[model samples]
Target: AGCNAGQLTVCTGAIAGGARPTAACCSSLRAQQGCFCQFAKDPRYGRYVNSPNARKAVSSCGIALPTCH
Candidate 1:
């Protein structure tokens, strides 16, 4: 989960590896909070931040994630 971590990084902006997060990424996460659960439910992105360890990593960033619907 090296660069895969970048998905959260890109979402958080702690690091901008290759596919860094853009302002749009933040906006999307905020606007699509309700859908995040679905993303988390999906196997594609689910394994990333959906897990406890990954959630901890993202929470460490101090980002106020939008609540799911």
Candidate 2:
């Protein structure tokens, strides 16, 4: 309940497509930063968020990946 996954919708395009993250995407990522660890532990969601494209998006957003576990 810390951060709603839906709050990250703005980042989906960049995360899934390897496009540069938009301002809204970066904002969402910042807001959801606290929830990444939980997301990382979920097998179904982890792969997507940890994907190369996703990682690239995160970098483009200037947000460091939260160390998971």
Candidate 3:
């Protein structure tokens, strides 16, 4: 299934932050957790998902970033 870029939009600024990921952002992440790697393939969202900050943000949300086999 394809992913909607909207859900991850919140993740960007949050991903770039030391600030705690917001409830809304984390919820969206969790909801779209399954689509992360798919989202990674999207350059629009990939820029954010591929970042070091993305790892931090995903970690903050308690999601293990997929290895994307």
Candidate 4:
């Protein structure tokens, strides 16, 4: 969880509330693909985690995001 918090902070801060994904943020998220979808659906955290930037970050790492209802 340590690594994820660090990476999540970086990625979330990179885009904040936007649709653009940063290279570094993408790089960070890609390394942690297993948690992407889960994070995206987390209502306590989802808004910040379910941006287009997050999708881009996940895709950048070559991982696909699951559909969120």
Candidate 5:
């Protein structure tokens, strides 16, 4: 129910291209931190967000990745 995919549009380019996330992307990521595990648990969605580029984008945004176990 939190961090809907639409709320994360601002991060698409950065996550796909390995660029630094924009301020808007960072903001959205921070706001959505609470929903990371839910996304991670989803087979359809997990691969995209768990990619190395996505991880790099999250790090570039200065948001630590949540342990999704």
Candidate 6:
């Protein structure tokens, strides 16, 4: 799958401890599904992936959690 970084704008803020997944966040999540696991495990943003707020954000968005990471 191609890992694009373009749709991070909406979801990034959600993962960064702002508001949880709204329409934009969920929309971005769906658009970036291919890159989701990579984004979660990337060094620059990995910490947020495991962080409480971020977990909550993605969880609420109905995103499937990664077990491989």
- What lDDT tens digits, residue by residue, belong to model 1 across residues 1-69? 222333445564422222244456655555545555454345465554455444444342222343232
Clashes in candidate 4: how many? 0
Error of 2 at 67 (Å): 6.2
RMSD of 3: 4.1
Evaluate model 4: give its lDDT: 0.46
Model 4 agreement with the true structure over 8-65: per-residue lDDT tens digits: 5654544343314544566556666666555555644445544556545443222323
lDDT tens per residue, model 3, 1-69:
225346545555555544255556666667667777675455465555546765555445444332132
lDDT of 6: 0.51
Cα deviation at 54, candidate 1, in Å, is 1.7
TM-score of 6: 0.47
C-alpha RMSD between model 5 and the true structure: 3.8
Q: Give all candidates' CA lDDT scores.
A: 0.43, 0.53, 0.52, 0.46, 0.53, 0.51
Q: Which candidate is the best by TM-score?
A: 5
Error at 29, model 5, angstroms: 1.6
* TM-scores of the candidates in the order shown: 0.35, 0.49, 0.47, 0.43, 0.50, 0.47
Clashing pairs in 5: none
> Candidate 3: deviation at residue 7, Å?
1.1
TM-score of 5: 0.50
Q: Put the candidates in TM-score order, highest first.
A: 5, 2, 6, 3, 4, 1
Any idea what lDDT model 2 has? 0.53
Cα error, residue 14 of model 4, in Å, equals 4.7
Model 2 deviation from the true structure expressed as Cα RMSD, one decimal place: 3.9
In candidate 1, list every pair of residues with a backbone clash. 10-21
| Quality of model 1 by C-alpha lDDT | 0.43
